[PDB]
């Protein structure tokens, strides 16, 4: 068809200029002339798009198409003397339909300056090696015979090198192997052997609580997850009980020396578990199942305090609403547990350390619950209704959070 601009827009323009009482044939005469000039320019701006080898366009093809037709490029002002603004364009007007029509010079100064990129360079790579396209990141994607393994010997040697580097004898070797896991596109069809190596490892690595072996395996899990190419939820049924035990298990090695790393190991395990509950989600299978196991870990009476601390951390990192509903009716039990560890003279065991870590974590989570959906007031002795665990020091932490909010 031949679509033109509407004539009922051309009469609005005419009567808002001082030219009243225009006929319909006078008004139809305006809207076939200007609709041709839009069609003449958009067909002529198409030349610059096809010779600019882009199709997408950069605000500027109409500026050269106008200059080609001996019409000045700038829109919104027309100079009848032509000399300060010749056929050089001013880049158009950054205007919107949903704009405010109100602007402040001070507000523009207040806005932070954006970042300017490094200048264009020239990198070379390989599309084809003697006919075959490589999988580099610059590329898009009755005696019978004996069978062969579905991995190549380069792939099997790669698996052996990556697994012997990921057990962390040297740190630079680990870090590359972790980046190699994080971005190898062909790491599918090797993924059963990686999942089995992880799963089997943690289970025979908690027989003796070897923390590095576990911290390296959790980093291997995290490096497996952020790889975008591979399909993981076929293997998550092996991945999730491995991270579960890491968080909810007792430490066979001495607790005091590597408790900070044990908390970090639980922290790595909770972070992967929360990412696991964020991805791979269908109705009522994964997130609710680990939530139920965490709550019956909490509810069970007279727990190991390592298991208690790990389950507390796992319950806490589940997001905004989960602590808004699951960390409310239980403060009295937490306080009673802290009071029992406090009473009595035996501190040799790990119970006291577990109690201090659990109380600190629970108190910080309470702070956003107090900040997110409550108003601060009576920060001196009202917390004694919650067994008086953090009290005024908790109030001081809330005040520091308020100061950080003011700085923001």
């Amino acid at each position: 068809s031949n679509t033109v601009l509407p004539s009922e827009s051309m009469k609005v323009v005419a009567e808002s200029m001082g030219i009243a009482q225009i006929q319909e044939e006078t008004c139809q005469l305006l809207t076939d002339e200007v609709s041709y000039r839009i069609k003449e320019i958009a067909q002529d701006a198409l030349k610059f798009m096809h010779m600019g080898k882009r199709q997408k366009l950069t605000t500027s093809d109409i500026d050269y198409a106008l200059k080609l037709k001996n019409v000045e490029p700038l829109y919104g002002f027309h100079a009848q003397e032509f000399i300060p603004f010749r056929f050089a364009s001013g880049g158009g007007r950054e205007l919107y339909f949903y704009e405010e029509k109100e602007v402040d010079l001070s507000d523009i100064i207040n806005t932070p300056l954006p970042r300017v990129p490094l200048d264009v360079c020239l990198k070379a790579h390989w599309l084809s090696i003697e006919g075959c396209q490589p999988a580099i990141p610059e590329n898009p994607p009755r005696l019978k015979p004996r069978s062969i393994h579905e991995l190549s010997v380069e792939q099997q040697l790669y698996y052996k090198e990556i697994t012997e580097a990921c057990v962390g004898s040297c740190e630079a070797k680990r870090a590359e192997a972790l980046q190699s896991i994080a971005t190898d596109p062909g790491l599918y069809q090797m993924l059963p052997r990686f999942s089995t190596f992880i799963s089997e490892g943690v289970r025979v690595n908690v027989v003796q609580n070897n923390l590095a072996l576990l911290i390296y395996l959790m980093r291997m899990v995290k490096a497996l997850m952020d790889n975008p190419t591979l399909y993981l939820e076929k293997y998550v049924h092996e991945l999730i009980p491995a991270v579960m035990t890491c968080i909810v298990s007792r430490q066979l090695c001495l607790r005091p020396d590597v408790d900070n790393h044990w908390a970090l190991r639980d922290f790595a395990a909770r972070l992967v578990a929360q990412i696991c509950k964020h991805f791979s989600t269908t109705t009522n299978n994964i997130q609710s199942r680990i939530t139920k196991t965490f709550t019956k870990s909490w509810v069970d009476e007279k727990t190991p305090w390592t298991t208690r601390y790990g389950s507390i951390a796992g319950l806490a990192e589940l997001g905004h609403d989960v602590i808004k509903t699951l960390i409310l009716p239980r403060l009295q039990q937490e306080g009673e547990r802290i009071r029992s560890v406090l009473d009595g003279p035996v501190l040799s065991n790990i119970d006291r350390i577990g109690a201090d870590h659990v109380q600190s974590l629970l108190l910080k989570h309470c702070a956003p619950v107090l900040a997110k959906l409550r108003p601060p007031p009576d920060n001196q002795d009202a917390y004694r209704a919650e067994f008086g665990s953090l009290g005024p020091l908790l109030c001081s932490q809330v005040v520091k959070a308020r100061a950080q909010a003011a700085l923001q």
């Binding site: 799963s199 943690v202 289970r203 908690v206 027989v207 939820e233 076929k234 293997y235 998550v236 049924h237 092996e238 991945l239 999730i240 009980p241 491995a242 991270v243 579960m244 035990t245 909810v248 298990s249 007792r250 791979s280 269908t282 299978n285 994964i286 199942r289 196991t293």
Partner: peptide, 25 residues
């Protein structure tokens, strides 16, 4: 709808806690 592919992915059909030995004999 219970024949949807996800129902059969072993993340939605496997108990991680149960699989681990957890020092139990």
């Amino acid at each position: 709808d219970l024949l949807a592919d996800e129902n059969f992915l072993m993340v939605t059909q496997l108990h991680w806690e149960d699989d681990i030995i957890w020092d139990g004999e």
